[PDB]
């Protein structure tokens, strides 16, 4: 359950956010510059929606080779040659935060790590300060962002 002899709340805690987009296809391979202008008309275009992980800022979808990408920062290539994916808008929403409650601390001036409302001990060992939607909170080594009392940079 716990680690390291730590035994004794309200915090802000945070990947289902969609990023609308499309795909360009021609049997030729690449027009990044005119694909956008083809979209600004509001080669062929079809809607393809992806999700971005708020920490890696990485778009995820089956159309992507390994299911990941990043946005150069202009185009993104898929499984095939002729297909490049491009966003309708070249960012994490700031309306995906919440207020959880797990009480955590071992000594008076020492905090080891918290426990979710499910019961799981996340340790505060080896975490780093991370800015996320403009508010400064720690990124844990397990990979979840929390806004705690806080001394390293991710």
């Amino acid at each position, epitope marked *: 359950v716990e680690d390291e002899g730590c035994t004794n709340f*309200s915090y*802000m805690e945070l990947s289902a956010i969609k990023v609308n987009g499309f795909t360009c296809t021609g049997h030729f391979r690449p027009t990044p510059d005119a694909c956008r202008a083809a979209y600004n008309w509001l080669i062929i275009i079809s809607p393809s929606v992806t999700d971005l992980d708020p920490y890696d800022k990485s778009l995820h979808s089956r159309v992507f080779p390994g299911g990941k990408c990043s946005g150069s920062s202009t185009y993104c290539s898929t499984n095939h040659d002729y297909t490049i994916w491009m966003p309708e808008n070249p*960012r994490t929403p*700031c*309306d995906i935060f919440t207020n959880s409650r797990g009480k955590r601390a071992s000594n008076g001036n020492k905090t080891c790590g918290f426990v979710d409302e499910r019961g799981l001990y996340k340790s505060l060992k080896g975490a780093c300060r991370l*800015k996320l*939607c*403009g*508010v*400064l909170g720690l990124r844990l080594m397990d990979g979840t962002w929390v806004a705690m009392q806080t001394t390293k940079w991710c």
Partner: antibody
Amino acid sequence: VQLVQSGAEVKKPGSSVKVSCKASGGTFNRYTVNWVRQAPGQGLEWMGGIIPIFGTANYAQRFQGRLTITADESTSTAYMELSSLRSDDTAVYFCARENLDNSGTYYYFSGWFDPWGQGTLVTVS
Amino acid sequence: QSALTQPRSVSGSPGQSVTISCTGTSSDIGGYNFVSWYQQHPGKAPKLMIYDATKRPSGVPDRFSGSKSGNTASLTISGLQAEDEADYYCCSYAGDYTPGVVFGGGTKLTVLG
């Protein structure tokens, strides 16, 4: 939104102040309360802010451990408590709101200070 | 800390146009930027003029206009009126590693005549 602060205060090298700010009308869910200060004849400086919905407070690197912003939704009152006052802490301390949008487009401490308080002059020595 | 670089003062006669520059605006790795300008009359609180780059709140005339270019930002007052004599501060989002916002030095606009 309408903002009014507590009155002026004269203090002492080594004492502590507490300034207040009560908010009247807020149709906004995503919002934030900040405190910027203004040394006499000098510019503005962001000191720290709070997200009252979650109680999360952010602070500048300076003013570390000397300052704590606490807000209360019930009375819509916010507070800055600065302790261990030096003489160069003589300034006017404004409280400013960030009435952010509920569609999550804008970050939490980007500096969209539309409602401002009248100010609180804190003198030391 | 640091601050945004502004001029110390600009001048204009009534009906003329002036532009206050601002350098060192911050931008996230992924491009989040947020510049804002405030107007402060002597002894009064700051008052918002431009909240996003080139965006105005209600009650601020179209005389006031913002612009962004890289880490630079410019505020333009057109048809300068006497009531525009005040201090002017740009304000930028500090970015990844500095908490909050960073203010500019402040620019004094004096209206002649």
